Amino acid sequence: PQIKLVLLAGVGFFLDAYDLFIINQVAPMLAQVYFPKTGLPAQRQDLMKAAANIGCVVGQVMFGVLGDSFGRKFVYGKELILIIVATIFQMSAPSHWDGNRVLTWITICRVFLGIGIGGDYPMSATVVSDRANIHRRGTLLCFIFANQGWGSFVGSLVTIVTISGFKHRLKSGHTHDVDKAWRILIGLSLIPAFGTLYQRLTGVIASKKAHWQEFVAYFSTWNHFRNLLGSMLGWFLVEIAFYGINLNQSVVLAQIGFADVYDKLFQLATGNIIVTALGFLPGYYFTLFLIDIVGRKKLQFMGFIMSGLFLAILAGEIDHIGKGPLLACFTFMQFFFNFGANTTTFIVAAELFPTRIRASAHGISAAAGKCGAILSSLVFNQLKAKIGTSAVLWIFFSTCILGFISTFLIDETMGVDPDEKDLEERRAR
């Protein structure tokens, strides 16, 4: 039946989101081993966490050109072996290496990982927006997207289960074993990755120029232009805050009160699991249960404006008030990222556009998102040192208000067939 396919994409999303966000759980493990007396250098950490997103855009452009050049049959398996191989290369960095060299190893692998994650990334959105042609398409997209929570959560659960498995060995003085853990965090993606590898297996310029002509004609009209503009902005703007935060959720929880060797790692994994269990994850399900009742915009407004509120509260109060209030707001924000703009910018970018031009607009929006993702991903930790976390949160707040303001450019997509609207638009003229 139709069911088995959407699960596989979810597991693909889970693996990407796992692979994407597991870096959030992996980065602190790298610090304790290779940089115990100081922290991970800012530019290298940004590049590493953006690396998957940078490779994610190069992946979706390269696996876009090859996918367009030689069809779907050419790209489907090769991306997963690429993230498996990139996972395996990433998973098996030499242990006797200098810290800076290990990081650069992982980034490049995470680019290729991102290139592989960049393959299947927009390709898991299209397959079910085309298929349904029914009012209940949004619940389905968010369900697969919610695996972004499970990827972040299971990565979070794997982390506490991993760390609590190494409990006694660490307390007895064998402090280097944490290096085994982060490979396990990444490597455990191989279980579904090979599981998925098993399951996945078990006139070129003339057309490109003609498609470019229709695309230019369509998005040269205001009521059509603004929707791509708002989609790019909303996705661009939220992925600034969303991946700024979710690739660095562990960094934010370290300014909040969650920061011996085991005690530290387990507490951070507890804050991560709390936030992702209580906020990041259920926010997808509050979105899941309300998109087809409340609408994408009001949730994006709320998501932007409330995550903006909580970003404004975080920005305003982070250096002045206690852990609990912040953790709630951060969980409220994470809740209102996924119960809001992070989820809706993914959905709205998929739903706005008639089929005849959808592929470019979503790729440009996702690229814009990855641009916003890589922008914050590329610079989140550098800005944190140059201007402070509160200032960045105000930026995320402003991007939420700009996300809020830019959200006005968008049409509501609940219950609308974009193809019948295009046909009636023309039969009227």
CA distance 183 to 105: 13
Q: Residue 256 has what DSSP assignment?
A: T
SS3 259: coil
Burial, 320: exposed, middle or buried (Cβ in 10 Å; 0-12, 13-18, 19+)?
A: exposed
CA distance 378 to 247: 11
Half-sphere exposure of 136 (CA within 13 A, CB side): 3
Q: Are 152 and 17 in contact (CB under 8 A)?
A: yes
CA distance 328 to 335: 10
Half-sphere exposure of 166 (CA within 13 A, CB side): 24
Amino acid identity of residue 280, one-letter, is F
Q: Are 193 and 77 in contact (CB under 8 A)?
A: no
φ, ψ at 358 (rounded to 5°): -60, -40
Q: Are 272 and 254 in contact (CB under 8 A)?
A: no
- Those residues whose C-beta lies under 8 Å from the C-beta of residue 230, and which sit 6 or more positions away, are 406, 407, 408, 409, 410
Q: Are 219 and 231 in contact (CB under 8 A)?
A: no
CA distance 299 to 306: 9
- Those residues whose C-beta lies under 8 Å from the C-beta of residue 416, and which sit 6 or more positions away, are 351
Nearest by Cα to 284 from 19, 21, 102, 72: 21
Q: Are 345 and 234 in contact (CB under 8 A)?
A: yes
- Those residues whose C-beta lies under 8 Å from the C-beta of residue 78, and which sit 6 or more positions away, are 119
CA distance 126 to 116: 17
Nearest by Cα to 413 from 318, 359, 345: 345
- Those residues whose C-beta lies under 8 Å from the C-beta of residue 367, and which sit 6 or more positions away, are 57, 60, 61
CA distance 226 to 206: 28
Helix axes 137-165, 342-351, angle to 10 degrees: 140
Sketch out the chain's domains with CATH numbers: 3-428 (1.20.1250.20)
